[PDB]
């Protein structure tokens, strides 16, 4: 015990001796001088590399421009923005509009209301477990967080449809600075969780007292939501009229319902999108399910089909060639230079200070180093003339026109392979052997915990 | 010829081969990455060194504080500020004042008028030389420049005295942004120079036409000066009354003249100050004279007594122990960190990028690398307990309270030895063998050109 | 062009020092050489000198990324301090030896290497050599992608349309007779390159040439006394 603990301790002579040796090295002397003065990323950004990688020529792009660049501001709504950014191109194109956005706020309101409701159910169903359990504590950590998955986006569209941002936008303070609202709701939900668990010690979930309690809680949650944002102006099957001007300055009027608008104008058929992921911790060709992660009670689960990078990459190119943008999930902001808008794992000269990272992808995920954190949209790529393989991708972010280069980012193929994980394509775009995994029946998914790194995107 | 020129040319293969070799070196790889991102001084500032050198404890200081810190702003008046900063301590002390300044603007007005006049005389006296000559071209380069030497400061005080800044301060735009005024005057003086030389081709300098011409030029120069600053409110032997409040809030009134004020209150006896310099290009113990450099026609010349650093340094300490601050000239801003206010030749880690400078002091001066550029004031120093030698000096700059640390700088002994050159002390402070050089008679000074690096201070 | 101009000027300075080693350190010429050896400014003849040796390339391949391209003062100071040290070393070695001496030849090579070493810390040597091919991808006004494979030297002629043997500088310098050529002694960058030469003409001629060039659809490079009588806010 003693000898071991002594050997494993920090010895003052040892570190001072190592210091003397390091100081004899000129690269070290230069590095410590520079790194005490500037942030490592600022100090190490490699302009020799930047000069070559910052390349905005893309020979494979979607025909419609992303106008205007969107901005989620201080909220974790990237999944909603990226999903709607893929669809708005259909509208911009079909209707010949200069600028257009589907309402991100519309989906945000319902997502939050549904998540708060979903939490009550999750608490009721896990009431048998101790308050200190990993699951119960995880449920209580961030019940109304903004982030989400593509399955949760479809869950919302199926119930609520889509509407032009013109009818309901980011006017409220809480759409662009959601933290306080989330805190207020969450404090209340944590109180509610205790009230339910307490009533459930004695009673059954189907008991009238519990049924009543939950109704009262739903009402209070809705009451508090409505103080920070208004319930959308039309119900899902209710008609709205939208007046707009096209590129030729011609006025048009559309009368539709949110549910009809999603199909008819946004062109979304909820039964076609499927998510593919490169999660090397698991065998390829297997479906992966994230237990519990959701928003609408009883809605679809988060499911991904695990495939290799060659397949993921080939699907992205084919989708772009088919004139459709690609929703993707990645580890933002790892190796991302926000000022130039370049995503390149070699853009900073870390090897020059002897900082090298051998840990492979599957292990980075397992060891808490890398996870999906943000959703963006691939709108173009450059396929090398000689290799017929993609070298870089054009990425539409939702951080406003000042982020990156006019709101757009350029990502290397290597970045895509290492720090990106999920893409969303339509099932008919898949080779029949991959499509089968979804339509087959009895492809038993590998079930991961609700807290898995391959989760929600903000 | 050919082979030599070829050998002395830049060869593309050679530089690309050297590039390949340099890139194999890790220190080089790190250096080029960092140096393409930040200014070298910002990148290389050594905080390990800063931590030790930025030391404001001084065991040897003058008794009176420099209140308030002065600011020359965008003008080259440092010589005037430093000279008056040494004297104002006498007034602050004697009169028990919280804050006080002698008028820097007062001296500035007369200095500029005198220099413009001095230029006309210099042109008349060198009319025998070609317009393209080194002297004539040098005279035409900056006839009304702000900078000056200590002898020029005394020349002004002897003729004009000194007055409280309360009677005449930096109100005019041109006192704090003198460039335009200087340009306007200089353009006119360049016209005048041609007019005089032209009239002198035919006539003698003592000719009535020339005498008249010069009078008309003086009048026009004064006319233009008076548009940018007012002539001081009282003549040198004219009485003024100055009302002020002391530290105990007591009101006092002083009636004096600028000439009496300089002696009586500022305590300046113009016959006592002498400049010593460490100019290793010349033998020590020799007087050095800068040919022509001056302001008042027929005034004293710039003369320095050349001595070694041990002597220069011993004189600074003794003067501070005698409770007097020390005017000094140095090469600002070589090795000066304006943000922290530290003057240290090792504060930046240039050796880490293999940038070393073996050129010695005398050679730096000869080779156009180092010269006197700015005047400041030593107000304290720290004499090492063990060595009984100074380690650092407390320097009062005239760049406002925001420069350095509350307007003050700390300078190492090595900085003083290498990038400082001149100090001003009183003749009675000198060993009789050094004092003799001045009072002796027939110590023939080494005469240097008007453009010598050991010149005016701005 | 900036990278090569500075490297060439630093090299040119060493040669200027070696050739004027017979003069006193305090001389007007030697002091002038030591004042600003790596200054940024230059003449049109120095621009052609560079293009003839190095060609031209799209900014897309090498732009103003480095700090020193847009704030060159510090870099210039650092190089200049070193060059001033080198000047003394050469003059000292030359007191004893002849310029063609092996010691001097070697010394200069070592100095060139150190100058290049220091240059490369602040900017990278361009990505392609003058006769080396590069590929440049770009998008035209119709959003069409194109790829050009060329060399800097071929690009200067083929795409930039510069034939270095055609440009000449005319000047209105009334200190001298019109119709006379004026040469500025020594001013240059590339050792042994063309000298700065101007043909002195009157304003009526200068002005008539500017109009005719514009009518021929070509812009006109000109030198003037900035910012005399220039209002920067209104332009």
HEC letters along chain A: CHHHHHHCCCCHHHHHHHHHHHHCCHHHHHHHHHHCCCCHHHHHECHHHHHHHCCCCCCEECCCCCCCCCECCECCCHHHHHHHHHHHHHHHHHCCCCCCCECHHHHHHHHHHHHHHHHHHHHHHCCCCCCCCHHHHHHHHCCCCCCECHHHHHHHHHHHCCCEHHHCCCCCHHHHECHHHHHHHHHHHHHHHHHHHHHHHHCCCCCHHHHHHHHHHHHHHHHHHHHHCCCCCCCCCCCEEEEEECCCCCEEEEEECHHHHHHHCCCCCCCCEEEEECCCCCCCCCEEEECCCCCCCCCCCEEEEECCHHHHHHHHHHHHHCCCCEEEEECCCCCEECCCCEECCCCECHHHHCCCCCCCHHHHHHCCCCCCCEEEEEEEEEECCCCCCEEEEEEECCECCCCCECCEEEEEHHHHHHHEEEEEEEHHHCCHHHHHHHHCCCCCCEEECCCCCCCCEC
For the beta carbon of residue B71, count every other beta carbon within 10 angstroms: 18
Tell me which residue of B167, B156, B169, B157 sits closest to B234, measured CA to CA: B167
On whether the CB atoms of residues B91 and B261 are closer than 8 A, the answer is no
User: Would you list the DSSP string of chain C?
Assistant: -HHHHHHHHHHHHHHHHHHTTTS-TTSHHHHHHHH-TT-S---HHHHHHHHHHH----GGGS-S-SHHHH--HHHHHHHHHHHHHHHHHHHHHHHHS-TTSHHHHHHHHHHHHHHHHHHHHHSPPPSS-TTS-EEEEEE-TTS-EEEEEE-HHHHHHHTS---TTS--EEE--TTS-TT-EEEESS--SSTT-PPEEEEE--HHHHHHHHHHHHHTT--------TTTT--TTT-
Dihedral Cα C200, C203, C209, C214, nearest 10 deg? 130
| C-alpha triplet C170, C175, C177: angle, nearest 5° | 65
Token readout for B73 is 């702003």
Residue of C nearest to B22 (CA): C117
For the beta carbon of residue A249, count every other beta carbon within 10 angstroms: 7
C204 Cβ contact partners less than 8 Å away, ≥ 6 residues apart: none
Taking the Cβ of residue A45 and every Cβ of chain B, the question of whether any pair is shorter than 8 Å is answered with: yes
Task: Give C192's contacts in chain B (Cβ within 8 Å).
Answer: 5, 9
Dihedral Cα A419, A425, A428, A431, nearest 10 deg? 0
Residues C169, C198: Cα–Cα separation, whole Å = 5
Residues A82, A438: Cα–Cα separation, whole Å = 24
Shortest Cα–Cα distance, A91 to chain B (Å): 43
Chains touching chain A through at least 3 C-beta pairs below 8 angstroms are B, C
Residues A405, C91: Cα–Cα separation, whole Å = 52
Taking the Cβ of residue A19 and every Cβ of chain B, the question of whether any pair is shorter than 8 Å is answered with: no
Structural domain includes residue B217: yes
Burial tier of C159 (Cβ tally within 10 Å: 0-12, 13-18, 19+): middle
For the beta carbon of residue B306, count every other beta carbon within 10 angstroms: 24
For the beta carbon of residue A24, count every other beta carbon within 10 angstroms: 9
A355 Cβ contact partners less than 8 Å away, ≥ 6 residues apart: none
Query: C82 to each of B454, C108, C115, C118, how far by Cα in Å?
Result: 21, 13, 8, 10
Residues B396, B343: Cα–Cα separation, whole Å = 12
Structural domain includes residue B203: yes
Residue of A nearest to C124 (CA): A48
B149 Cβ contact partners less than 8 Å away, ≥ 6 residues apart: B79, B275, B290, B293, B302, B455, B456, B457
Residues B289, B296: Cα–Cα separation, whole Å = 17
| C-alpha triplet C35, B8, B16: angle, nearest 5° | 100
Burial tier of C100 (Cβ tally within 10 Å: 0-12, 13-18, 19+): exposed
Give resolution, Å, one decimal.
1.9
Residues B74, B71: Cα–Cα separation, whole Å = 9
Q: Which of A47, A55, A385 sits opposite C65 (nearest CB)?
A: A47
Token readout for C200 is 């002195």
For the beta carbon of residue A350, count every other beta carbon within 10 angstroms: 16
A222 Cβ contact partners less than 8 Å away, ≥ 6 residues apart: A113
On whether the CB atoms of residues B162 and B258 are closer than 8 A, the answer is yes
- How do strand C196-200 and strand C169-171 relate by DSSP bridges? parallel
The residue length of chain A stands at: 458
Q: Which residues pair with B242 in a beta bridge?
A: B254
Query: B346 to each of A19, B45, B137, C133, how far by Cα in Å?
Result: 21, 9, 39, 45
Residue of B nearest to A50 (CA): B33
Residue A174 Cα to chain centre, angstroms = 19
Tell me which residue of B281, B273, B275 sits closest to B448, measured CA to CA: B281
Please, which residues 65-124 of chain C have a Cβ atom closer than 8 Å to chain B?
65-68, 71, 74-75, 78, 81-82, 84-85, 87-88, 99-100, 105, 108, 112-113, 116-118, 120-124
Residues B455, B290: Cα–Cα separation, whole Å = 7
Token readout for A119 is 């939490």
Bin A290: left if φ > 0, else alpha if -120 < ψ < 50, else beta.
Answer: beta
Shortest Cα–Cα distance, A390 to chain B (Å): 28
Please, which residues 132-151 of chain B have a Cβ atom closer than 8 Å to chain C?
134
Residues B32, A29: Cα–Cα separation, whole Å = 15
Question: How many pairs of residues across A and C have Cβ atoms under 8 Å apart?
Answer: 19
Residues A420, A336: Cα–Cα separation, whole Å = 12
Task: Give A354's contacts in chain B (Cβ within 8 Å).
Answer: 26
For B335-338, the CB contacts below 8 A with 24+ separation are B335/B415, B335/B419, B336/B409, B337/B41, B337/B45, B337/B50, B338/B399, B338/B403, B338/B404
Range of the domain at B180: 59-458
Q: Is the dihedral of CA A157, A163, A167, A172 positive or negative?
A: positive
Residues B333, B341: Cα–Cα separation, whole Å = 11
Residues A365, A320: Cα–Cα separation, whole Å = 28
Structural domain includes residue B220: yes
A80 Cβ contact partners less than 8 Å away, ≥ 6 residues apart: A72, A104, A107, A108, A111, A148, A153
Token readout for C1 is 């062009």
Residue C59 Cα to chain centre, angstroms = 18
Tell me which residue of B224, B227, B153 sits closest to B187, measured CA to CA: B224
Residues B329, B302: Cα–Cα separation, whole Å = 13
Structural domain includes residue A447: yes
Token readout for C160 is 């930039």
Residue of B nearest to C72 (CA): B39
Residues C10, C112: Cα–Cα separation, whole Å = 8
On whether the CB atoms of residues C180 and C216 are closer than 8 A, the answer is no
Token readout for B115 is 């220099």
- How do strand B273-277 and strand B302-306 relate by DSSP bridges? parallel
- Chosen for mutation from B31, B32, B34 (greatest number of chain A CBs closer than 10 Å) is B34
Token readout for B255 is 């009636």
Tell me which residue of B141, B165, B146 sits closest to B75, measured CA to CA: B146
For C176-185, letters b (16+ CB in 10 Å) and e give eeeeeeeeee
Token readout for B402 is 């925001």
Residues B278, B360: Cα–Cα separation, whole Å = 13
Q: Which of C14, C82, C116 sits opposite B15 (nearest CB)?
A: C116
Burial tier of B283 (Cβ tally within 10 Å: 0-12, 13-18, 19+): exposed
- How do strand A408-412 and strand A342-343 relate by DSSP bridges? parallel
Tell me which residue of A227, A231, A199 sits closest to A213, measured CA to CA: A199
Task: Give B369's contacts in chain C (Cβ within 8 Å).
Answer: 81, 84-85
Q: Do the chains contact at A48 and B36, CB–CB below 8 Å?
A: yes
Residues C103, B173: Cα–Cα separation, whole Å = 58
Residue B375 belongs to domain with CATH number: 3.90.70.10
Tell me which residue of B134, B179, B427 sits closest to B291, measured CA to CA: B134
For the beta carbon of residue B275, count every other beta carbon within 10 angstroms: 21
Q: Which residues pair with A447 in a beta bridge?
A: A289
Q: Which of C62, C138, C139 sits opposite A51 (nearest CB)?
A: C62
Query: A165 to each of A132, A162, A258, A401, how far by Cα in Å?
Result: 43, 9, 12, 18
Task: Give B36's contacts in chain A (Cβ within 8 Å).
Answer: 47-48
Taking the Cβ of residue B28 and every Cβ of chain C, the question of whether any pair is shorter than 8 Å is answered with: yes
- Taking only Cα atoms into account, the Rg of chain C, rounded to an integer number of angstroms, comes to 21
Give phi and psi for A242, each to the nearest 5.
-125, 120
Residues B190, C233: Cα–Cα separation, whole Å = 28
Structural domain includes residue A9: no
> ω before A172 within 30° of 0 (cis)?
no
Burial tier of A235 (Cβ tally within 10 Å: 0-12, 13-18, 19+): middle
The residue length of chain C stands at: 235
Structural domain includes residue B31: no
Residue of C nearest to B17 (CA): C113
A104-125 and A150-160 helices, crossing angle to 10°: 110
Residues A126, A291: Cα–Cα separation, whole Å = 14
Query: B214 to each of B200, B210, C103, how far by Cα in Å?
Result: 12, 6, 59
Taking the Cβ of residue C4 and every Cβ of chain A, the question of whether any pair is shorter than 8 Å is answered with: no
Residue B31 Cα to chain centre, angstroms = 36
Tell me which residue of A348, A361, A359, A368 sits closest to A312, measured CA to CA: A361
On whether the CB atoms of residues B92 and B103 are closer than 8 A, the answer is no
First to last CA, chain B: 46
For the beta carbon of residue A387, count every other beta carbon within 10 angstroms: 8
| C-alpha triplet C157, C208, C173: angle, nearest 5° | 90
Residues C91, C107: Cα–Cα separation, whole Å = 11
Taking the Cβ of residue B22 and every Cβ of chain A, the question of whether any pair is shorter than 8 Å is answered with: no
Dihedral Cα A395, A399, A404, A405, nearest 10 deg? 80
Q: Do the chains contact at B368 and C34, CB–CB below 8 Å?
A: yes
C2-19 and C44-54 helices, crossing angle to 10°: 110
Structural domain includes residue B250: yes
Taking the Cβ of residue B15 and every Cβ of chain C, the question of whether any pair is shorter than 8 Å is answered with: yes
Q: Do the chains contact at A30 and B31, CB–CB below 8 Å?
A: yes
On whether the CB atoms of residues B293 and B329 are closer than 8 A, the answer is no
> How many domains, chain A?
1
Taking the Cβ of residue A59 and every Cβ of chain C, the question of whether any pair is shorter than 8 Å is answered with: yes
> ω before B333 within 30° of 0 (cis)?
yes
* 3-class SS letters over chain B: CHHHHHHCCCCHHHHHHHHHHHHCCHHHHHHHHHHCCCCHHHHHECHHHHHHHCCCCCCEECCCCCCCCCECCECCCHHHHHHHHHHHHHHHHHCCCCCCCECHHHHHHHHHHHHHHHHHHHHHHCCCCCCCCHHHHHHHHCCCCCCECHHHHHHHHHHHCCCEHHHCCCCCHHHHECHHHHHHHHHHHHHHHHHHHHHHHHCCCCCHHHHHHHHHHHHHHHHHHHHHCCCCCCCCCCCEEEEEECCCCCEEEEEECHHHHHHHCCCCCCCCEEEEECCCCCCCCCEEEECCCCCCCCCCCEEEEECCHHHHHHHHHHHHHCCCCEEEEECCCCCEECCCCEECCCCECHHHHCCCCCCCHHHHHHCCCCCCCEEEEEEEEEECCCCCCEEEEEEECCECCCCCECCEEEEEHHHHHHHEEEEEEEHHHCCHHHHHHHHCCCCCCEEECCCCCCCCEC
Residues B322, B300: Cα–Cα separation, whole Å = 27
The single residue listed with the structure tokens 């060595």 is B387
For A436-445, the CB contacts below 8 A with 24+ separation are A437/A285, A437/A287, A437/A305, A438/A274, A438/A287, A438/A305, A443/A286, A443/A287, A444/A287, A445/A286, A445/A287, A445/A288, A445/A289, A445/A303
Structural domain includes residue A314: yes
Residues B9, B4: Cα–Cα separation, whole Å = 9
């Amino acid at each position: 015990a003693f000898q071991g603990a002594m050997a494993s301790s920090i010895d003052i002579s040892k570190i001072n001796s190592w210091n003397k040796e390091f100081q004899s090295d000129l690269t070290h002397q230069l590095a410590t001088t520079v790194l005490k003065n500037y942030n490592a990323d600022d100090a190490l950004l490699n302009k020799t590399r930047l000069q070559k990688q910052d390349n905005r020529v893309f020979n494979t792009v979607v025909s419609t421009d992303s106008t205007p660049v969107t901005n989620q501001k201080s909220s974790g709504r990237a999944w909603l923005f990226a999903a709607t950014n893929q669809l708005r191109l259909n509208v911009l194109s079909e209707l010949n509009l200069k600028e257009f956005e589907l309402s991100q706020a519309y989906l945000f309101f319902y997502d939050k209301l549904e998540k708060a409701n979903y939490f009550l159910d999750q608490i009721v169903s896990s009431a048998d477990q101790d308050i200190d359990s990993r699951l119960v504590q995880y449920l209580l950590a961030a019940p109304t967080e903004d982030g989400g998955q593509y399955s949760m986006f479809l869950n919302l569209v199926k119930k609520y449809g889509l509407i032009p941002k013109d009818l309901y936008g980011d006017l409220p303070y809480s759409t662009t600075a959601s933290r306080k609202w989330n805190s207020l709701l969450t404090t209340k939900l944590r109180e509610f969780a205790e009230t339910l668990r307490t009533a459930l010690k004695e009673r059954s979930a189907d008991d009238s007292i519990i049924v009543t309690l939950r109704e009262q809680m739903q009402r209070e949650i809705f009451r508090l939501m409505s103080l920070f944002m208004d319930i959308p102006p039309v119900q899902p099957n209710e008609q709205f009229t939208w007046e707009y001007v096209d590129k030729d300055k011609k006025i048009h009027t559309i009368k539709s319902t949110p549910l009809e608008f999603a199909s008819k104008y946004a062109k979304l058929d909820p039964s076609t999108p499927v998510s593919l992921i490169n999660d090397p911790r698991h065998p390829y060709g297997k479906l992966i399910k994230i237990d519990r992660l959701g928003n609408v009670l009883g809605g679809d689960a988060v499911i991904y089909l695990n495939v290799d990078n060659e397949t993921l990459s080939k699907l992205v190119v084919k989708r772009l060639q088919n004139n459709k943008a690609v929703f993707f999930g990645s580890h933002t902001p790892k190796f991302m230079d926000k000022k130039t808008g370049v995503m390149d794992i070699e853009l900073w000269n870390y090897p020059a200070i002897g900082y090298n990272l051998p840990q492979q992808k599957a292990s980075r995920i397992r060891y808490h180093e890398s996870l999906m954190t943000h959703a963006m949209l691939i709108t173009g790529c450059h396929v090398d003339e000689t290799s017929k393989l993609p070298l870089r991708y054009r990425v539409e972010n939702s951080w406003g026109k000042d982020s990156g280069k006019d709101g757009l980012y350029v990502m290397t193929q290597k970045y895509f392979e290492e720090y990106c994980f999920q893409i969303v394509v339509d099932i008919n775009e898949l080779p029949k052997e991959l499509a089968s995994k979804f339509t087959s029946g009895k492809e038993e998914p590998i079930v991961l915990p609700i807290w898995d790194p391959m989760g929600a995107l903000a």
